[PDB]
Design a protein around this ligand. Sequence first.
Ligand SMILES: *[C@@H]1O[C@H](CO)[C@@H](O[C@@H]2O[C@H](CO)[C@@H](O)[C@H](O)[C@H]2NC(C)=O)[C@H](O)[C@H]1NC(C)=O
Ligand SMILES: *[C@@H]1O[C@H](CO)[C@@H](O[C@@H]2O[C@H](CO)[C@@H](O)[C@H](O)[C@H]2NC(C)=O)[C@H](O)[C@H]1NC(C)=O
Ligand SMILES: *[C@@H]1O[C@H](CO)[C@@H](O)[C@H](O)[C@H]1NC(C)=O
Lengths: 395, 395, 395, 395, 395
Amino acid sequence: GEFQRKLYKELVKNYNPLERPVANDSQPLTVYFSLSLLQIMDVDEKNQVLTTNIWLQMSWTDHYLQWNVSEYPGVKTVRFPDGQIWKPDILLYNSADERFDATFHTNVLVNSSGHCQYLPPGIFKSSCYIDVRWFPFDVQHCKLKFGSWSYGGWSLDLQMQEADISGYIPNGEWDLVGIPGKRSERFYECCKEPYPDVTFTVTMRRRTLYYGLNLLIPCVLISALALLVFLLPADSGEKISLGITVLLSLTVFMLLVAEIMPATSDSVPLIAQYFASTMIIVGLSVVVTVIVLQYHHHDPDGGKMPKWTRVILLNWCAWFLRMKDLAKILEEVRYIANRFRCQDESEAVCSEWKFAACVVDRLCLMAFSVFTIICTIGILMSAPNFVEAVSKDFA
Amino acid sequence: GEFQRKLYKELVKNYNPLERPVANDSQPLTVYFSLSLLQIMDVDEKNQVLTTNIWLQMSWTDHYLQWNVSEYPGVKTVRFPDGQIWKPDILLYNSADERFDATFHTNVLVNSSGHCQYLPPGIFKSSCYIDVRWFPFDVQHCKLKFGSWSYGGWSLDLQMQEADISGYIPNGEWDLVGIPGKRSERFYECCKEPYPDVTFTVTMRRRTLYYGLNLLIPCVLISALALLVFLLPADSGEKISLGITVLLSLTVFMLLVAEIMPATSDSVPLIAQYFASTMIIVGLSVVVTVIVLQYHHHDPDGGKMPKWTRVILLNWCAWFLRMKDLAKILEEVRYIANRFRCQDESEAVCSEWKFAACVVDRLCLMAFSVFTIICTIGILMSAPNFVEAVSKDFA
Amino acid sequence: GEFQRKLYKELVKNYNPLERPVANDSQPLTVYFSLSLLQIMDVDEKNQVLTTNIWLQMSWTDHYLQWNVSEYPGVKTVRFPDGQIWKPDILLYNSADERFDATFHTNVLVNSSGHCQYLPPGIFKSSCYIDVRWFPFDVQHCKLKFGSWSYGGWSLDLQMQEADISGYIPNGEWDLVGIPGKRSERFYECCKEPYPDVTFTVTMRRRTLYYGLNLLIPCVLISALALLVFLLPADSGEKISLGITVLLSLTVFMLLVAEIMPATSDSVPLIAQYFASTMIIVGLSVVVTVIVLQYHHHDPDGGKMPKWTRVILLNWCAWFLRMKDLAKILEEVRYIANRFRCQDESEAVCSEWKFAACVVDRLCLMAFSVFTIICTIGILMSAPNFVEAVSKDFA
Amino acid sequence: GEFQRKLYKELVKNYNPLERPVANDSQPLTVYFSLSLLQIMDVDEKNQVLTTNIWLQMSWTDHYLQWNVSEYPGVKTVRFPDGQIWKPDILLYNSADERFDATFHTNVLVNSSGHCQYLPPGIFKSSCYIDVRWFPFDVQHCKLKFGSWSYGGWSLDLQMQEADISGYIPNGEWDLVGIPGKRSERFYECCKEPYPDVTFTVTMRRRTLYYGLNLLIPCVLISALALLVFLLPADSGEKISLGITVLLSLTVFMLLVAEIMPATSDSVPLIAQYFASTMIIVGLSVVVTVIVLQYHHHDPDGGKMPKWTRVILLNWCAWFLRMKDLAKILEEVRYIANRFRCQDESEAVCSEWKFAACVVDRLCLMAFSVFTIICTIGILMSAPNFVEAVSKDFA
Amino acid sequence: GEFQRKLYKELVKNYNPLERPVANDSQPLTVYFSLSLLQIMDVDEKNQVLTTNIWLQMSWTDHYLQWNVSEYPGVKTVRFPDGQIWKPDILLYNSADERFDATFHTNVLVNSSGHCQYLPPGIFKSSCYIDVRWFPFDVQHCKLKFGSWSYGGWSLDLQMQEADISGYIPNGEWDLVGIPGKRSERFYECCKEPYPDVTFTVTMRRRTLYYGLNLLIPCVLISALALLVFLLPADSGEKISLGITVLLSLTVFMLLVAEIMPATSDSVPLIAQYFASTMIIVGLSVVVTVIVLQYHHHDPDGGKMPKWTRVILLNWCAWFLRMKDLAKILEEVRYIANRFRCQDESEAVCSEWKFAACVVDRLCLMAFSVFTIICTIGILMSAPNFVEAVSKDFA
Ligand SMILES: *[C@@H]1O[C@H](CO)[C@@H](O[C@@H]2O[C@H](CO)[C@@H](O)[C@H](O)[C@H]2NC(C)=O)[C@H](O)[C@H]1NC(C)=O
Ligand SMILES: *[C@@H]1O[C@H](CO)[C@@H](O[C@@H]2O[C@H](CO)[C@@H](O)[C@H](O)[C@H]2NC(C)=O)[C@H](O)[C@H]1NC(C)=O
Ligand SMILES: *[C@@H]1O[C@H](CO)[C@@H](O)[C@H](O)[C@H]1NC(C)=O
């Protein structure tokens, strides 16, 4: 138009984009700063970073960009691109990014009274420490610290406004708890002036539905599958063909677990020690079934059945469980009969040994069950906010 | 040439690329906006993004770029690069991109009446929520929301035109259903002026041919392979050498399944619960086998054959199935005969127990089949648009 | 030098890099366009793109860049950087690239008569549809479509020249067949002027040596390894310990196959159905060997040997195969003799059943071999250009 | 303001950003250089690089940027962007980076006396040699070498200041030991002037908690699980059903080990030879078992029991271990008796052979245990700072 | 300073950065070119590229940048940034890079006589053909071809200088052999003037320590572990439980081999055919075992022991190996005796068949050993520079 052309020609005359737009040079310039969170992109525990989508919001006042609306009855606001007017240098301090800015400087909008507003959108990669002591049941607090790079507290004083969580697009893996802000001042013992900054604390909680279905339940159908070796009669020629195949079927289960657990060496995750306990129990279940077949396959005429074995394994532990010419012909037939009687005696001795083996089997069955139940309950229930997680997530 | 040189010199004289090219400054500038979809590149459920190839199209009118064709009889159109003439600032709102623009501003073509046309091509990464409750049979709706960053409804009013699906280059994994557009206005209670925007809704459907061939059929040849353990006589020493090898051969099958299923914890996918049901059925098929070999390997002189076991397992359930000197020599020979008779009696008792075991085997065979059939049919048929998917994809 | 300094000062005087360098403004400017292919980098079937290394070549004539060599006896050619003289705006149309250009604008060389030559090198990512119906034996045709963005046919008319395949650096995975070009004109019913474009069609063929050695022969040593279960006597207690281990040894073979096959759901690849046939045959080989051990382990006094079973399995199918006081002592000894005779009769019945089982085993052996041979030959030989591929690749 | 506007207009008048801001051109310009480490991002042994987060700090003095505060009572400091004033050209020498700079040049702050301070933040990818001879127990020293690209020692002399490790954000995988600095001068035999440079040496130590729990303990529960094959009686038909399944269950354990061990061919890592020893011991445990069942399954009438075998295996090694008409009837019965006696003699011979086999089994059991214990202790304890690592990490 | 300010103001007066800085325009400008290799980053055989770290070095003379040191007694050298003075346009020809330059143009240093030096550092991605016929024992020659883009031999003649291998930082995977250079001229039949270029040939050798320890030895302990099946008596019910588990334990070994071997289809690597031979031998070892148990489990009264089988398998091949009223009572007892004699005859026939089986077992054992030894030695020793590789690498 005819009027905005001359307005734009007049506004930028004798304008310096390097000076602070204040009328006295001794008074601070109040800048209002706010943030808007759009979505949480990633939380990386390897490099300890947090990738989020954020729109900043900055507002201030300019003194050399004022005009009278009556003289220009067609224009009420103007817009200036990057590098033509003064803008605050507020930027993220952590900024664990390659280019360190990720801001995409957009246009700046100015009213007829000089009130300037500037909001750039971006994807921010902050650096926060991640604690993974309780890997599945985890709650994290990360920080975003904003401030001016080269302005003091008597030139550019930051002010804080509440964030905006409208339109959050929930992640589906991390449950956002909150994001409060706080403004702080840091004095230095050379200047006696403040250096304000504004920090926002994102607090979030991990969802434990995928891990409780794809990791836990699979490994409780295998830990309890080993115990069947204590209910299988030893007469069948397959007692380690089942005991050693459950261990191999679970060793291949750790190939899809190692792609989930973290690689940090600071602490031992809860799921790691749970899986270690399952490993140890399944491995130790195979040791016992070798001390049972030694009892079952004992030589009839190569042992003595020690008295202690007969008392412990047949009287005490078996009552708790509630188990319970003519002369030559005569000589030849007598020989055959004696042979048969000797075989019968050997069979009786073998039967005693087999009963001892069965008693051992039931004794070993009765204890591994309580062991695995106690371990499974205690390891999982030791973590805090476990009841909170199972109430919010499953139910 | 001689004429276009002076035309280009004259057009850019006293021209400001910051002002809106209108003749009154109080009338809106109508801008026509349209879109062209070239292909769908990716749909990422981890970060919940959608990558597509799109050519935007913008058209408007300029007032300071008008000339008379009679005075310049050689030129009818002109072209201006980026940064030399005014262009609308319409841009995507979601834009879950690092650089946030992905536009590649090309040249602007101007006719002899000022009608300007500008179409930049690009690859756009929008952010839309993805629901994966029914993972294989899935239908998704995503949105692309375009508007002006810093212009109101009384300065730059958007207008909508239909999209263009010519030359779509079908993806081969997602079946496009449609892409309709809609224009909306959003009033604010400080200005009483509209802020129009234009949104296009891409609706697409997932193709279920790869999943039905590479995932389902493999796991129906293994779920039905376990049932053979109920048709194998127990005399052979292989009843757990087959029962436990099918479970291990399916545990290694979940290594190529975990690379397909999503990792979202918001809901339980249909394929996940189907695979869990298969897991549970195959695991429980091994528990029953141990309770069959206990019947087969029973001690002849260590039990009593309870009456209930004899009635249920041999009378009722067995009829539904339609199973059905001289003195010493004499004494020695009599001893041998009595021994043989005792062995015969023991063999008869063992035979009764083996028949009971066979009856149990057939009873257990008759039920697991209906269990697996019911589960397989019901889980898959519960999803909506299942008939539509199988009609469009397979047939 | 003294002369080229004044030449450069004189050439760029009153020069506009925005106008078309023609002497009448009504005559077209002929631009000669050609291409040079350096190597094929990648062919991605997921996003359906083709990445290649290409040097374009453009030539035209300029009217304002002419000088007399006699006046400047030291200079014959000049060079201008990007942004100082007019260049054609020919670019790839498909250009499924993030930055959409990938051109690296180099210097422009000008002779003493204005003849300008300009060749930029780059890596181009085109978008072409990939058909994978016959995955190993595959032939692909992709297109590269070049043209001017904003110039008609009466201002900048494209001309075509043959490509240059010298220095091709063969890929080692794709065998290049050819690359012919074609020029086309597209009229529009608003202007009645042509809009020429130039398209080059790269035709290539896949090499099938890696797949035929690392995927096929592996799975013919396992498909034929299962059949040995039909040559193993049933007396040994290992018949399912071999049948079920070949299936598990091939289920783990699909872990290194799933990383090669494509994920497209448009059609079923040939190798996919070949592997499915191998899976089905190996799985069905285990069903039969359970109906053989049922015949071998039959109870002597629990069946009747149906007449049909005796005729089919022992007369017809067995001839095709070419298989083929004193009283008490007397009473006791007579009892023992009768016992022995009964045992002999039972053994004879068992022997008959075992012979029936062996006949079944040979009958089942004779058919699976022809099944697998027919499937293996027919599935592979059904693809076209199979003889061409095996002649060019292996021999 | 009114005053800083004229100050900025006056400072940049007749200013050249190419000249060194010194007052005599023959005196050196002292530049103070310091570094601040924020966190360690990665240590890559494949390409031998180290990625860290670092803020440099540079300070110097300018002569043309001095003003009087009394004349401008409102301003005390000024700020200049990149490309408007002179800055030192100190950069990292190693800089194994694509863009080689990674600096993000920020603003430069100037006091009222010309003292300039400039600190750019960035992510630096240095190139240092990594020694992995002792892979788990590893200590690394990497270098960062800074200096001026094109300034001598008589123009820009570097000065060193101590680093700053405040706010380190510990990595959780590498334990930082220290980072001392050193300044050096390098004369050349053409100029006789120094060329100073400043080098910082980051010394760090690897944490060995993850490797000692997820790699070692798993493989000590499998190496010791094979030895059970020497405590399992040979009467049960499972002795290579356990010996060969432990080897297969640990062959699948090397799939999750190969993703951790380095691929360098310069030296043999300690964990590699430890795993090789476990491979060899477990594989050799199966060879012995075959030489035990040959003794157990010896033919009664097909051998002689050599004298050496009887002395070594039954006298010496068995005492260390502390093992320990009427005529025809008469003829027929005598025949039966003789048959029985022959069978008894054969059984006695078989019993002798089985005892020899058991002695061999115990002899082989007693040695593999000490072998594996010695190997496990010696291989791990040979590395230096092993006690230091286990004291700092585990306890 | 006062003097360098006026020197900088005077040098750039009337200076054109587009002209060649020569004093006659008819004489060539000699440019000295050299290279410095810092480290080898990668050698990729998929896309056939080579990534290295290189500092170029260029030197020439300028005519308009000369001054008298007496008039400016404080300055001896000057520095100019990119884009202010003339620089040669030498660049890499292959340059299989996205941006095609990777140069990072630094400052240019000029002495008081005009002698200019310019050395940019960078990471270069060249394109060279990689031959992988002998994958472990491999020697590669790649080329780097430098030259001027648009200057002839009568304007800018290249000169060559030796490279600099000081500070090489050895890779640890590729052993550098050398890097010699060569300068060449290429005439064209339109101009009759040379077009010189400079090429450096990097020759390197692969280190074979990782492959010889992590791939070969693992697959030698498994190839020789199968042969134990020929030393295991058939009485034990484990002869296929060991033969088929070694094949499955080696099928899972190809999962960590497929991540190492190349995917090129141009030629078959040596390691590929070695692994194929191991596969074939291990698979064929199981076929023979089935033909041994057919001999051992032969029916006593279902065969005839063909004469050829008795001569070959028991006379010739067994000598090479050095194997070696009263009437009824009488009738009943006679019946029992006859039964016993028949059983004895059947047992004798079975014993003959078992001896034949043992002879077959030893005959098969004696040949597979020489087969595997010959294959293993011949395949590895066929490659050239094998002795050189094992001498430099292992010893
Ligand atoms: C401008 O700021 C600089 C900051 O370095 C001041 O230099 C330091 O000033 C303090 C104050 O006395 C001294 O203790 C230090 O020794 C100074 N540093 C050096 C390297 O000398 C400088 O004095 C300030 N100038 C004015 C006029 O305030
Ligand atoms: C400016 O520096 C250049 C650096 O190359 C000097 O050129 C070399 O000078 C040495 C000193 O005598 C000679 O030995 C070399 O032969 C020169 N190089 C060449 C390629 O000729 C140059 O002399 C210096 N000029 C002044 C005035 O000091
Ligand atoms: C600027 O502020 C100071 C106090 O902060 C005041 O003394 C001075 O008068 C102000 N400037 C003007 C021009 O009034």
